[PDB]
């Protein structure tokens, strides 16, 4: 009902934070030449359509992606608002939206749903990723409170604490995107509740530069490409 606890703390935000603390794990890592996003997906359903095109990971425009921990129903309302804002910026300025302007845009909407008592807050945590000329490769996180922070590597959702410790000891400022592929897969295999990692339990993506000077490219990996980085990395659930 958006009233303070006597400590000056918001009960609804704390309960929304309890909800996302169950909501599946996501890791993001910022290499010297690209960003990696990975998310672990609890497929307890055989008849759920794996090889559906998205669940945890989404495009916001041609150079920005997100991972979702939380309610996917809540996330998709924010994701569409961010997509509309990215194209409305591109229409106005003829230029691609800077990552800080969009990440904090979704952090200002999520704060409003925490102040007015007719609205429940959004049960979603986002690990944003992208490139722009103002900064370069940027990795941000945002949570049900409307707080947002810049990171070199971060986890959200379940098992955050184990994942942050594993990131901290292996992360290097000068590492390449293929080292961040390896690291994010290792971290998730060293954090997972499921017995071993496999291509349908895993959502993956990258924000590389490629060979051509003007390019930045956002491969949100199809299952067969994820099977290749799995067998190359030594996670290798292979015949």
């Amino acid at each position: 009902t958006t009233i303070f606890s006597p400590e000056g703390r918001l009960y609804q935000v704390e309960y929304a934070l309890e909800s996302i603390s169950h909501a599946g794990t996501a890791i993001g890592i910022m290499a010297s030449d690209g960003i990696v996003l990975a998310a672990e997906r609890k497929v307890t359903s055989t008849l759920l359509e794996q090889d559906t095109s998205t669940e945890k990971l989404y495009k916001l425009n041609d150079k920005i992606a997100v991972a979702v921990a939380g309610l996917t129903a809540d996330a998709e309302i924010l994701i569409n608002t961010a997509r509309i804002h990215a194209q409305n910026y591109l229409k106005t300025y003829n230029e691609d939206i800077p990552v800080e302007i969009l990440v904090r845009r979704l952090s200002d909407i999520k704060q409003g749903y925490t102040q007015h008592g007719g609205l429940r807050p959004f049960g979603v945590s986002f690990i944003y990723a992208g490139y722009d000329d103002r900064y370069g490769y940027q990795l941000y996180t945002s949570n049900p409170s409307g707080n947002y922070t810049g990171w070199k590597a971060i986890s959200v959702g379940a098992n955050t604490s184990a994942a942050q410790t594993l990131l901290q000891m292996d992360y290097k400022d000068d590492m390449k995107v293929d080292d961040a592929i390896e690291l994010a897969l290792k971290t998730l295999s060293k954090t997972t509740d499921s017995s071993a990692l496999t291509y349908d339990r895993l959502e993956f993506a990258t924000i590389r530069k490629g060979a051509n000077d003007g390019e930045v490219y956002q491969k949100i990996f199809k299952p067969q490409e994820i099977k290749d980085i799995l067998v190359k990395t030594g996670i290798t659930k292979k015949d």
Binding site: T1, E18, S19, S21, L47, T72, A73, I77, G118, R120
Partner: protein, 246 residues
Amino acid sequence: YSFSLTTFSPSGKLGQIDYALTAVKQGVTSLGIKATNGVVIATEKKSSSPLAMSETLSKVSLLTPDIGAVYSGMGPDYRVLVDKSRKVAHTSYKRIYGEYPPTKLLVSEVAKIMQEATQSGGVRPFGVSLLIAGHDEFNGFSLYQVDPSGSYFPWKATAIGKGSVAAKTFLEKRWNDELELEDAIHIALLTLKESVEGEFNGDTIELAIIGDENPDLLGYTGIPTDKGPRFRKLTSQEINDRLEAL
């Protein structure tokens, strides 16, 4: 002003929606199966009296000429969503693109309507889970489930209502990735034969398919460009003929 409904319970749960999934869990079962060349959606018709004419209570509904829907839960909640879902298909997509929306864009729009009922004062969430099934030129055949939360899921097969856990276990046991539409019809008729509360025949059972185009049902000739309805609702005689092959 202390005004909202569906607020968070201390364990990180939404509460009212949980009670809305107990209303869904009490409905007459409905189910859906996706095949290699078509899809099936099916349910039972429960009569309030044997004097009732259940040619009037359709449960399986056309959303666009290539998309069907069925429910479990409160039928009144389902008559009101189906007519908004029809209006949405025309106003958002057909009148801009001159073609009907896919079965992922219409499912998103139905789910957006059910999400808005959770995040409101003044309104309870819906008492229905919807199975939406269809075809599109680039996605192909698809089946989705939508719940009172506004969460939607793509499924290979599913069931909802009273008999849903035994139906979902039979659907896991029988589904394979090479089914055809006559096979999926047989599996769906077998699944309702276990979940049926009343009598089992072509009059108590609702069954629809999205399959091949049927140029007979377009009702006008001269335009091959227009292929004709994929969505077809099985006639009570076809259901009784297939129920003789059972």
